[PDB]
Amino acid sequence: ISPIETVPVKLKPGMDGPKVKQWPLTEEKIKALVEICTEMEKEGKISKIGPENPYNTPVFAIKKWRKLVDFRELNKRTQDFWEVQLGIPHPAGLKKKKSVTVLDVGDAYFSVPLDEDFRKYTAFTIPSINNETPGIRYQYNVLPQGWKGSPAIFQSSMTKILEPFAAQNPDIVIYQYMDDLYVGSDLEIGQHRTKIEELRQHLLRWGLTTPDKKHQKEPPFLWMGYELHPDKWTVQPIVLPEKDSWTVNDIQKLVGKLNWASQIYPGIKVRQLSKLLRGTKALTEVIPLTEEAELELAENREILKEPVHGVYYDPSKDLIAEIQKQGQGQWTYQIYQEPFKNLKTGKYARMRHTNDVKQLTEAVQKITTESIVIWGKTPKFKLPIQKETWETWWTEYWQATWIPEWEFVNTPPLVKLWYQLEKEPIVGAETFYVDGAANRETKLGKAGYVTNKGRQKVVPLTNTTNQKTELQAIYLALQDSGLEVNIVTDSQYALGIIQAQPDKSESELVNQIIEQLIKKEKVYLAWVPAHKGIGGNEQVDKLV
Amino acid sequence: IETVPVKLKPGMDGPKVKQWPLTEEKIKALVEICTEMEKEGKISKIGPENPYNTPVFAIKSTKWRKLVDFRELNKRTQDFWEVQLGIPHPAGLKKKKSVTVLDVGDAYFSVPLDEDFRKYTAFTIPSINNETPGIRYQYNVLPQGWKGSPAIFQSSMTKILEPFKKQNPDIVIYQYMDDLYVGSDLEIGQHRTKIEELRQHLLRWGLTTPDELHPDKWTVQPIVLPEKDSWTVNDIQKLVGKLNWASQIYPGIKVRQLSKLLRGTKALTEVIPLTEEAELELAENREILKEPVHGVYYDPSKDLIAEIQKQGQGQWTYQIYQEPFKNLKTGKYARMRGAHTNDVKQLTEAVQKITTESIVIWGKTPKFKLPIQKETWETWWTEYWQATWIPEWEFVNTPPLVKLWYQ
Numbered sequence: 001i002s003p004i005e006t007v008p009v010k011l012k013p014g015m016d017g018p019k020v021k022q023w024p025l026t027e028e029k030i031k032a033l034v035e036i037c038t039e040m041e042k043e044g045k046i047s048k049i050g051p052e053n054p055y056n057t058p059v060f061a062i063k064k065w066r067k068l069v070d071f072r073e074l075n076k077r078t079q080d081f082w083e084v085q086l087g088i089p090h091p092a093g094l095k096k097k098k099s100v101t102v103l104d105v106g107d108a109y110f111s112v113p114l115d116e117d118f119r120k121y122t123a124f125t126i127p128s129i130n131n132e133t134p135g136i137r138y139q140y141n142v143l144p145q146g147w148k149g150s151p152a153i154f155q156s157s158m159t160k161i162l163e164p165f166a167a168q169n170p171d172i173v174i175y176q177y178m179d180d181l182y183v184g185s186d187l188e189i190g191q192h193r194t195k196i197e198e199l200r201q202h203l204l205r206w207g208l209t210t211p212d213k214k215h216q217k218e219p220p221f222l223w224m225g226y227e228l229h230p231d232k233w234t235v236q237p238i239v240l241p242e243k244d245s246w247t248v249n250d251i252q253k254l255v256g257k258l259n260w261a262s263q264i265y266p267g268i269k270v271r272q273l274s275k276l277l278r279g280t281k282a283l284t285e286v287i288p289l290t291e292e293a294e295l296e297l298a299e300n301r302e303i304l305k306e307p308v309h310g311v312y313y314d315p316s317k318d319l320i321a322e323i324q325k326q327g328q329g330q331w332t333y334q335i336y337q338e339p340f341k342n343l344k345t346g347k348y349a350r351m352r353h354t355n356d357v358k359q360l361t362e363a364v365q366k367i368t369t370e371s372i373v374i375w376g377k378t379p380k381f382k383l384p385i386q387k388e389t390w391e392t393w394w395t396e397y398w399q400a401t402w403i404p405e406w407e408f409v410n411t412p413p414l415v416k417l418w419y420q421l422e423k424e425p426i427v428g429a430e431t432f433y434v435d436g437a438a439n440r441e442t443k444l445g446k447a448g449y450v451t452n453k454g455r456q457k458v459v460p461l462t463n464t465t466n467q468k469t470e471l472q473a474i475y476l477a478l479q480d481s482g483l484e485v486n487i488v489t490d491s492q493y494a495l496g497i498i499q500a501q502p503d504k505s506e507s508e509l510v511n512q513i514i515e516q517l518i519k520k521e522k523v524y525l526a527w528v529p530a531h532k533g534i535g536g537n538e539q540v541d542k543l544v
Numbered sequence: 545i546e547t548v549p550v551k552l553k554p555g556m557d558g559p560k561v562k563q564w565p566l567t568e569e570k571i572k573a574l575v576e577i578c579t580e581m582e583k584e585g586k587i588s589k590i591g592p593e594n595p596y597n598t599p600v601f602a603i604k605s606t607k608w609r610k611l612v613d614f615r616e617l618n619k620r621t622q623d624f625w626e627v628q629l630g631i632p633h634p635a636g637l638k639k640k641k642s643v644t645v646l647d648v649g650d651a652y653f654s655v656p657l658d659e660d661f662r663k664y665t666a667f668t669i670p671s672i673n674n675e676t677p678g679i680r681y682q683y684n685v686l687p688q689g690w691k692g693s694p695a696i697f698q699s700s701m702t703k704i705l706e707p708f709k710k711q712n713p714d715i716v717i718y719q720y721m722d723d724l725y726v727g728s729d730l731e732i733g734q735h736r737t738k739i740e741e742l743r744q745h746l747l748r749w750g751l752t753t754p755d756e757l758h759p760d761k762w763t764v765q766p767i768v769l770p771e772k773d774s775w776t777v778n779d780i781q782k783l784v785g786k787l788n789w790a791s792q793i794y795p796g797i798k799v800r801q802l803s804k805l806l807r808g809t810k811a812l813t814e815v816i817p818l819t820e821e822a823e824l825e826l827a828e829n830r831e832i833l834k835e836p837v838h839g840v841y842y843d844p845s846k847d848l849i850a851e852i853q854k855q856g857q858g859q860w861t862y863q864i865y866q867e868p869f870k871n872l873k874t875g876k877y878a879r880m881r882g883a884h885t886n887d888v889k890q891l892t893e894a895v896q897k898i899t900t901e902s903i904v905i906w907g908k909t910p911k912f913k914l915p916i917q918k919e920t921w922e923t924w925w926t927e928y929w930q931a932t933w934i935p936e937w938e939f940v941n942t943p944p945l946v947k948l949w950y951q
């Protein structure tokens with residue numbers, strides 16, 4: 001226990017403590033329990049109690065033995081607390097120190113006192129053999145294992161205990177994490193060990209044991225799935241399994257390790273490997289490794305072959321981020337201050353059918369958010385797009401977009417606008433009046449056009465939708481026209497898709513239309529109300 | 545002095561909103577501001593038994609100002625502290641020639657805050673890279689941005705303002721959160737002097753303020769049909785399409801005489817003279833659209849919705865409505881900065897201008913449908929925010945095919 005002041009705690013509004021029942025337990029267990037509760041009572045962590053306490057909580061025992069108290073019922077009744085840290089610090093954002101020491105406090109929660117007026121609700125009962133002698137009543141004086149309050153209270157106690165030491169030692173950096181401390185310094189190694197030894201003495205005066213140099217751990221460090229080395233970091237070694245049959249569960253785990261590895265191994269792809277999991281319900285259904293997925297899995301194995309490492313942060317050097325396109329809504333980026341070492345890497349994939357420039361902007365945004373979290377600043381951007389390309393797109397795009405400080409990098413693939421529609425209709429160009437229509441029941445439909453020069457066509461269509469025929473019409477007019485064409489449609493849908501100027505889509509039709517749009521020289525698309533008898537349009541809806 | 549007790553709506557628990565990550569520069573500025581505030585008693589540090597939280601920001605001038613987003617605590621409290629302690633909105637403020645906004649938030653900081661309420665004002669200064677859990681405070685005095693603050697202070701305010709109101713029975717003064725809106729009909733020169741009089745009145749009564757709108761033009765702008773010498777088939781098609789979209793708001797538009805004027809499947813650049821029967825519709829429809837709509841009344845029990853559209857070359861259009869197609873106000877914000885402005889700066893000024901107009905006209909702010917990617921806005925909006933309130937907002941998914949229909 002410790003002379004730390006207690007944090008006051010309340011039960012949830014309108015509620016009383018847990019009055020659960022203790023199921024009878026076997027004989028050799030009832031023995032090994034009291035062999036713990038007499039030791040814990042001696043050390044002041046518990047205290048036998050009278051009959052006046054009406055609450056109780058179950059207690060179990062499990063492999064020397066070990067005591068265990070299911071607090072899940074009391075956890076449902078205690079007030080809520082400030083949430084402990086959700087995320088953890090990222091290695092790419094530590095600043096190099098001359099020396100780092102790792103200290104872990106034992107019996108952590110038991111070394112911290114529990115608020116007095118709340119100790120009653122922790123009562124428990126060791127049962128008598130053959131349910132006869134009254135039960136041995138108890139209760140906690142310290143932070144019980146697995147209680148809702150214990151982590152947040154321990155955190156702030158530790159934080160308060162560190163205060164008098166941090167004030168006498170402003171040159172040294174302590175990180176808190178659950179039950180660890182990570183102490184860094186730029187002191188010469190003899191000074192550093194003395195400071196560590198006087199930190200431990202301080203923490204010992206407040207009732208917190210820590211390991212001596214006989215067991216104070218040493219680089220490299222295996223922390224939360226990383227390998228932290230004196231002047232570099234990497235992920236802990238990844239193991240991609242080789243199986244002939246792959247379960248839905250197993251694909252998830254594989255995508256996990258692949259995402260995990262992507263923070264430092266550049267160029268991991270996960271598009272095809274998770275397209276698999278798109279239609280998932282059952283966790284155990286075996287899935288065929290499609291051909292495209294198997295290629296990506298093989299290419300990831302290639303990248304993971306040789307290890308690679310990241311560096312740590314230096315605040316005096318610039319922060320640079322560089323972006324490359326991978327090919328199918330797939331993007332990869334590196335963050336660095338030096339030309340042969342990265343701070344970290346990662347990927348952006350777009351779900352939901354955009355174009356390259358829109359996607360590039362979303363990737364810049366993701367990186368900006370991440371930079372801020374990790375370093376507290378935004379990087380300069382090196383981007384594979386010409387300024388004039390980009391000024392053209394953002395000036396005409398319906399959304400507002402922020403373009404940060406960036407400069408062009410001439411590494412293919414470049415990001416470009418592939419075609420552009422016209423702003424006003426073309427002269428000396430044939431004017432096609434297209435329309436289309438289907439039947440929701442039969443899935444039969446037709447697409448056709450009518451031109452000002454009296455040309456006409458109608459094509460039959462099976463297995464289609466009013467949406468798909470309206471796009472089919474526009475494809476027809478693009479097929480049967482010259483290098484300049486005016487198209488006139490009564491469909492805001494099809495007008496929406498093309499005016500968005502995509503360069504790829506998850507529907508094969510829209511891809512063919514994009515090809516024609518590249519081939520053509522000037523294409524003006526124009527819109528009129530359907531079924532309003534405008535003229536030109538009234539004659540094509542009749543045909544279709 | 546005695547504290548006004550403050551209760552939440554029954555069954556409503558306190559705010560638990562997540563704190564955004566911030567620049568190191570913003571973090572440091574906040575740590576400075578809060579170190580002085582703890583020093584003057586205005587706020588105090590709290591333990592983990594306080595679970596509530598409310599986001600905080602840093603904005604500007606050259607001083608960093610701190611800005612607490614109290615939107616969630618406002619819904620959970622002031623919605624009963626607009627009934628129990630409401631401040632009535634004067635319908636004659638929109639009529640005055642000149643309206644000046646004066647910041648009086650500094651008055652609240654003397655007055656203590658109800659002891660049992662302080663827990664719900666918790667906020668966190670965040671740390672970079674999750675190094676530390678965060679620095680946690682709660683208010684001991686009435687906070688800026690909380691709507692219950694000027695509610696509680698309203699009696700003091702009505703008292704300090706009463707001598708000024710007697711010598712100036714023609715000057716309307718409305719309090720909305722931290723600001724006094726003051727409207728006169730005086731010439732600009734007299735009104736300005738009259739503003740300095742009220743500054744000096746407030747300053748000799750112990751309210752410092754750290755130191756112009758014309759709600760005469762404020763209306764629903766009329767729709768503009770293009771004025772053309774000659775008309776082509778494409779022009780008639782754009783005209784027929786716009787006029788058909790207007791029929792949803794101004795019923796009584798007629799187009800049959802205009803549709804006949806494109807009877808055969810002509811080419812798209814073919815000029816077609818307008819018939820007399822055609823020019824009759826264009827004239828008869830240009831007049832039914834210069835006159836305002838019928839049936840369009842503000843409902844105080846509904847929420848105002850603002851929609852903004854980007855238009856090009858620093859021009860933005862907006863409409864404020866409660867029901868589709870019944871616009872209570874429309875306008876056009878144009879930022880003149882000479883390519884020293886980007887879209888995000890312009891959208892931010894637009895939102896602030898629309899919100900102030902909405903405050904003057906109705907005493908309420910709208911919820912904005914913003915044409916911008918969410919994370920982009922969540923990252924840069926504070927860069928140009930100058931107001932002390934924050935409207936509610938959300939993000940538009942699909943573009944408008946109705947773009948030039950408001951230009």
Ligand SMILES: N#Cc1cc2c(Oc3ccccc3OCCC(=O)N3CCCC3)cccn2c1
Pocket residue numbers: 089094095096097100101102173174175182183184185219221222223228229230231312
């Ligand atoms: N197990 C573990 C572990 C260690 C650290 C950690 O070390 C630091 C502690 C205090 C200041 C800077 C630090 O890191 C400096 C960067 C550095 O040169 N190194 C060398 C090996 C460890 C990192 C910080 C955060 C989490 N930790 C988790």
